[PDB]
Amino acid sequence: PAVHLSNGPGQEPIAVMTFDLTKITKTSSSFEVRTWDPEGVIFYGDTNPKDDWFMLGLRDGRPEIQLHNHWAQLTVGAGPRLDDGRWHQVEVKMEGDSVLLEVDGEEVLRLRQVSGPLTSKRHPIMRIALGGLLFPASNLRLPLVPALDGCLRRDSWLDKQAKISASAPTSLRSC
């Protein structure tokens, strides 16, 4: 059962979830995606949309990560083209101080020294948005057009035991 990653012309995400970082023990997510679209947002996350945020998307058909926090600020593309209309397995893992991206079972990117332990300075509420950003696309380090005409399935996001809230699922469209 797959859901569309874009619902109409607007750039708003199709789903938002909120997590308690003080309770999280699983810092990875996994999903399958299929698209003919070379550009868009797969997911966005933040503890503060001004000061601590990240984005996984596609640009020129390839994975792109942008992130901005006090440890690191970067815009990186990596991995194979995903816009070939086949299902691809994606996993994003925060391990130690590093973020790992795996595509179809292969590690394609490791961003080192981009994260740290949870400090009382870090706001302990993390949002995850699917298919869109929680700020205007112009606040990205490198703007793109967020709409991603693709399908998502088999998706697991961080640690369900730490989830505080999730948007209503009746706004979702089956593929």
At 143, phi and psi to the nearest 5? -55, 145
- Which CB atom, from 8 or from 96, has the smaller least distance to a copy of itself? 96
Among 13, 40, 45, 57, binds ligand P57 (CB under 6 A): 45
58-75 in b/e form (b: 16+ CB < 10 A) is: bbebbbbbbbbbeebeee
Q: Is 49 left (phi over 0), alpha (psi -120 to 50) or beta?
A: alpha
Which of positions 128-147 make contact with ligand P57 (CB under 6 A)? Answer: 128
**Does residue 48 bind ligand P57 (CB under 6 A)?**
no
**Does residue 82 bind ligand P57 (CB under 6 A)?**
no
- Which CB atom, from 35 or from 44, has the smaller least distance to ligand P57? 44
**Does residue 29 bind ligand P57 (CB under 6 A)?**
yes
CA angle 8, 10, 14 (to 5 degrees): 70
Stretch that binds ligand P57, among 21-29, 34-42, 78-86, 147-155 (CB under 6 A): 21-29
**Does residue 40 bind Ca ion (CB under 5 A)?**
yes
At 83, phi and psi to the nearest 5? -95, 45
**Does residue 93 bind a copy of itself (CB under 8 A)?**
no
Token output for 90: 């994606």
40 contact choice in Ca ion, ligand P57, a copy of itself, none (CB below 5 to 8 Å, kind-dependent) = Ca ion
Contacts of 89 (CB under 8 A, 6+ apart): 30, 31, 32, 102, 103, 104, 105
Among 16, 21, 108, 166, binds a copy of itself (CB under 8 A): 108
What does the DSSP 8-state code read for residue 133? -
- Which CB atom, from 40 or from 63, has the smaller least distance to Ca ion? 40
Among 37, 104, 155, 159, binds Ca ion (CB under 5 A): 37
The residues of the shown chain that bind a copy of itself, judged by CB under 8 A, are 62, 72-80, 106-113, 141-142
